[PDB]
């Protein structure tokens, strides 16, 4: 799962807990305010709103098979 | 695997 909380560490709640295996890396698209993550099990890059809504998946990346950080 | 080395 990928969890969100207040910067205080309270209000901890999952926001992405479906179709996930090894979500190694996280990133924020500061321009669009969108959370990006990446899987090492399914080998996919995904991005969504900060609430975990509007989930999208990027196209296949040729030789990416164990992405750690992004 | 996925462990840190
Ligand atoms: C996986 O991740 C999902 C989220 O993507 C989690 O589901 C959410 O669990 C949360 C628990 O903290 C809840 O916020 C939320 O469930 C409810 O949300 C309701 C919001 O009200 C609107 O939406 C409902 C949708 O069914 C609709 O029926 C209603 O008319 C409104 O339009 C709340 O009302 C509801 O409150 C109930 O539960 C709380 C306890 O949690 C009680 O205190 C209340 O009295 C009441 O009985 C509740 O908050 C969940 N959202 C979704 C998408 O279902 C999963 O929990 C995660 N699971 C795992 C395995 O990690
Ligand atoms: Ca793999």
Residue A3 and residue A21: Cα distance in Å, rounded? 14
A34, β-bridge pairs: A29, A49
Rounded to 10 degrees, the C-alpha dihedral A66/A19/A52/A17 comes to -110
User: Exposed, middle or buried, A5 (CB in 10 Å: 0-12/13-18/19+)?
Assistant: exposed
Q: Which residue has the tokens 């910067």?
A: A7
Please tell me whether residue A24 adopts helix, strand or coil conformation: strand
Calculate Rg over the CA atoms of chain B. Answer: 4
**Hey, what are A31's tokens?**
């321009």
| B2 CB within 8 Å of a chain A CB | yes
Residue B4 and residue A69: Cα distance in Å, rounded? 12
**Cβ contact A47:A40 at 8 Å:** no
Which residue in chain B has the smallest CA separation from A24?
A: B2
**Hey, what are A13's tokens?**
């709640």
Rounded to the nearest whole angstrom, what is the distance from the C-alpha of residue A53 to the centroid of ligand 1?
14
Resolution reading in Å: 4.2
Q: Solving technique for this entry?
A: cryo-EM
């Amino acid at each position: 799962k990928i969890m969100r909380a207040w910067s205080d560490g309270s209000h901890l709640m999952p926001i992405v807990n479906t179709s996930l295996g090894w979500p190694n890396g996280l990133a924020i698209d500061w321009s669009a305010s969108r959370l990006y993550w990446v899987d090492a099990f399914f080998d996919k890059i995904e991005h969504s709103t900060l609430d975990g809504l509007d989930r999208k998946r990027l196209g296949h990346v040729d030789q990416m098979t164990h992405p750690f950080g992004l | 695997x996925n462990x840190x080395x």
